[PDB]
Design a protein that fits this description.
47% helix, part of a larger assembly, Spike glycoprotein, 1 helix, SARS-CoV-2, 2 chains, binds a molecule of 2 linked components (NAG-NAG), rod-shaped, viral protein, mainly alpha, Spike protein
């Protein structure tokens, strides 16, 4: 993977994305469209 | 023995058949060389950069 070129890691890890999705899903279960 | 390159040497656990000289993976990238004196397989790693 190292021959003259590099790969940069993503800024957002997978756990943070999962946490965002969980927050959105809980919000849409409880409140509905009001929290938007 | 005529194959030149740059990197860092280390020990390797791969096993060669009794007649090959040196291995590779893809795109002419050497990855395993055996010293003629010891008949032991070594390993090449590119030096760190960034
Ligand atoms: C290079 O070849 C010599 C032979 O001329 C090897 O020397 C022998 O090595 C074995 C393994 O240790 C010993 O059992 C023998 O007694 C050695 N014989 C002599 C005459 O030295 C040597 O090991 C080989 N490799 C290197 C790195 O020198």
């Amino acid at each position: 993977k190292f021959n003259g070129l590099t790969v940069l890691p993503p800024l957002l890890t997978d756990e943070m994305i999962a946490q965002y999705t969980s927050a959105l899903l809980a919000g849409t279960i409880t409140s509905g469209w009001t929290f938007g | 023995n005529g194959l030149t390159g740059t990197g860092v040497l280390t020990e390797s656990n791969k096993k060669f058949l009794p007649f090959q000289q040196f291995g590779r993976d893809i795109a002419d990238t050497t990855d395993a060389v055996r010293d003629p004196q010891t008949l032991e397989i070594l390993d090449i790693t590119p030096c760190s950069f960034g």
